Structures are given as C-alpha cells and as structure tokens.
Amino acid sequence: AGTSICTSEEWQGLMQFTLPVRLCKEIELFHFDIGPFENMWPGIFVYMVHRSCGTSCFELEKLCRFIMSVKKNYRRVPYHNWKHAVTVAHCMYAILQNNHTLFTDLERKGLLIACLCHDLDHRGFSNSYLQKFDHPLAALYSTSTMEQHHFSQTVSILQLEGHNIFSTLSSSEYEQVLEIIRKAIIATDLALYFGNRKQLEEMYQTGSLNLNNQSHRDRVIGLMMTACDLCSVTKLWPVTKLTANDIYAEFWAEGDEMKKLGIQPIPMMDRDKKDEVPQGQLGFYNAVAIPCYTTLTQILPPTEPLLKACRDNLSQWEKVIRGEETATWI
Numbered sequence: 181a182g183t184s185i186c187t188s189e190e191w192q193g194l195m196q197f198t199l200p201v202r203l204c205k206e207i208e209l210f211h212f213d214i215g216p217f218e219n220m221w222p223g224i225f226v227y228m229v230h231r232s233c234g235t236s237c238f239e240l241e242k243l244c245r246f247i248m249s250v251k252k253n254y255r256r257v258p259y260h261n262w263k264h265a266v267t268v269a270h271c272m273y274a275i276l277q278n279n280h281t282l283f284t285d286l287e288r289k290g291l292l293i294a295c296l297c298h299d300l301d302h303r304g305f306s307n308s309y310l311q312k313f314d315h316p317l318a319a320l321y322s323t324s325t326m327e328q329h330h331f332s333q334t335v336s337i338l339q340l341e342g343h344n345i346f347s348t349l350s351s352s353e354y355e356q357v358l359e360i361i362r363k364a365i366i367a368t369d370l371a372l373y374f375g376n377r378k379q380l381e382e383m384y385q386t387g388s389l390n391l392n393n394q395s396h397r398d399r400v401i402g403l404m405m406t407a408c409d410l411c412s413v414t415k416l417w418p419v420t421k422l423t424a425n426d427i428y429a430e431f432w433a434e435g436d437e438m439k440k441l442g443i444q445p446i447p448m449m450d451r452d453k454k455d456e457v458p459q460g461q462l463g464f465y466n467a468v469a470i471p472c473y474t475t476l477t478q479i480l481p482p483t484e485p486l487l488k489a490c491r492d493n494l495s496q497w498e499k500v501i502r503g504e505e506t507a508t509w510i
C-alpha cells in the first residue's frame with residue numbers, strides 16, 4: 181500500500197558516494213557485469229547519468245532522492261528487482277554512449293530513467309497470471325498490464341516531495357519526456373516486441389526506416405528497450421547462467437500458485453519440469469533474443485557486441501543440450 185520513500189540517511193549517502201577509479205573504464209563496455217559491486221549500484225547510476233547527460237542535467241539532491249526511492253519501490257523478488265533495474269539501465273548507457281548524437285538530450289535522460297524504473301513494484305507474477313486470475317491490475321490495465329503499472333509507479337515517485345527531477349524542463353519538454361518514458365516502459369512488454377521487430381526489420385530491409393520520423397524513432401527506442409531488458413543474455417556465460425537461475429526461480433514460484441488454482445502451468449513455470457529448461461532457453465534465444473539483437477545491430481551498428489555475445493550464449497545452451505556442460509556454481 182502506497183509509495184515507499186527513501187530516508188534522509190539514504191539519499192545523503194548517495195550524494196557523497198564516489199566511484200572507484202578502476203570502474204570508470206569498465207562501466208563503458210557492453211559486457212560489464214554490475215554483480216560484484218552491490219553497494220555501488222546507486223552510485224553507478226548517478227555516474228552514468230552524469231556522463232551521458234552532464235553533471236548539471238538534474239539537481240543532485242532531487243536525483244539522489246529519486247534514485248533511492250526507486251530502489252525502495254523494487255520488491256525482494258528473485259529476478260524483477262533492483263539489480264535487474266540497474267543492469268537494464270547500464271545496457272542503455274552503453275547503447276547511448278556508442279550512439280550518443282542519434283538521440284536528443286531529452287531522449288537520453290528519459291531513457292536512462294525509464295530503464296531504472298521499468299519494472300517498478302513488480303511482484304514476481306507475469307501478465308499471463310494477472311489476467312488469468314483477474315487481479316485488480318488486469319481490470320485497470322487491459323493490455324500490457326504490469327508495464328502500465330510500472331509507468332504509473334514511476335509518475336508516483338516523481339510526484340513525491342523533492343523527487344521531481346524533471347521540474348526544470350519547459351512545460352513542453354516535460355510532456356515530451358513523460359511520453360518518451362511511457363512509450364519506453366510499455367515497449368518492455370514482450371508481447372509487443374514481436375510486432376515491433378517485424379516492422380523494423382521490414383522498414384530496414386526496404387530502406388524506408390527514417391529516424392527523422394517520430395513513429396520510426398519510437399519503434400527504434402522500443403527495440404532498444406527490449407535489448408536492454410534482455411541483456412543478461414549478452415554477458416559472459418557464467419553471469420548469464422546465474423541470472424537464468426533467478427529468472428526461473430520466479431517462474432517456478434508462479435507455476436506453484438497456478439497449481440493451487442487447479443491449472444497445470446506451462447512447462448517453463450513447472451518446477452517438476454527442469455529437464456526442459458535448456459530446450460526452453462534455445463526456443464527463447466531463437467524466437468526472441470537473437471532476432472532482437474540482429475535487427476538492433478542492423479539499425480545501430482555499434483551495438484554489434486550485444487549480438488556476438490548473445491550468439492555465444494546460444495552456443496552454450498546448445499552445449500548443455502548435447503550434455504557437454506562443465507562445473508557450474510549457484
């Protein structure tokens with residue numbers, strides 16, 4: 181109930197945080213894994229906003245309040261949590277740095293914030309579940325149910341006293357950035373990814389894609405959001421494999437709930453069907469991840485390292501299926 185608010189201790193702490201010098205270089209690379217640096221995660225986000233958008237883009241006190249309240253409105257779920265938010269924000273930073281001048285100052289600030297906020301107040305349940313069992317959220321938000329909720333949570337946080345990092349924008353720029361953020365969060369609904377990627381692929385192959393056309397820009401930003409949201413598949417294999425354990429922990433918890441409601445879950449969500457997981461990952465990489473990064477690389481050539489890493493991880497899942505896995509830790 182209600183929107184959680186960080187403490188004075190929390191945001192003042194972030195304000196005075198300084199990032200270890202060695203990490204500056206690392207944070208620029210697509211393959212950077214925030215995993216080993218938990219205490220630094222909020223500071224890593226400040227650093228990225230300051231590098232991309234400038235140290236004067238946001239009032240520092242309001243930014244620190246905003247970040248630490250965002251952290252507080254992520255739940256202690258296995259995957260759709262604070263760590264995931266920062267991971268997705270980092271991928272976006274890396275995409276923006278490599279493509280900086282394709283995007284406006286307003287788009288860059290909106291997108292970094294959209295990524296940090298995009299799974300706010302996630303409960304560990306899928307759209308499929310909410311709609312199957314008529315949760316109140318599915319009544320309010322007939323499609324893209326959780327994503328409309330995450331956007332609503334973002335606006336709630338901005339509305340807290342001293343949290344509105346966008347207030348200094350002109351009235352027109354303020355409306356524009358909230359729309360950038362709304363569209364970007366909604367785009368993280370994978371249901372919409374399939375149509376979006378197909379359209380972009382067609383616009384690319386026929387040469388009609390035009391980034392001066394707002395509807396095209398919106399679709400490109402959409403695919404960037406998918407690429408950032410799925411970016412665990414673009415890390416080094418051990419990192420990718422550990423994250424997949426967290427993703428499946430959520431899925432199996434949801435399948436357990438469906439069993440109590442008299443419905444057998446899809447195999448992916450069935451903890452008694454773990455043998456099917458490697459084939460399931462193959463299906464997901466083939467149907468979602470590989471096409472996404474393929475089209476993104478076509479439109480934005482500097483993102484190629486995401487595609488190469490995704491392909492390397494597909495190969496690893498294939499090795500699993502063939503029985504060639506070596507020792508793994510969890």
Ligand SMILES: Cc1nc2ccccc2c(=O)[nH]1
Nearest residue numbers: 409410411412413424427464
């Ligand atoms: C099935 C599935 N696998 C994933 C692997 C990595 C990142 C995200 C996902 C996901 O959303 N679904």
Ligand code: NI
Nearest residue numbers: 298299326368
């Ligand atoms: Ni989501």
Ligand code: NI
Nearest residue numbers: 298299368409
């Ligand atoms: Ni997400």
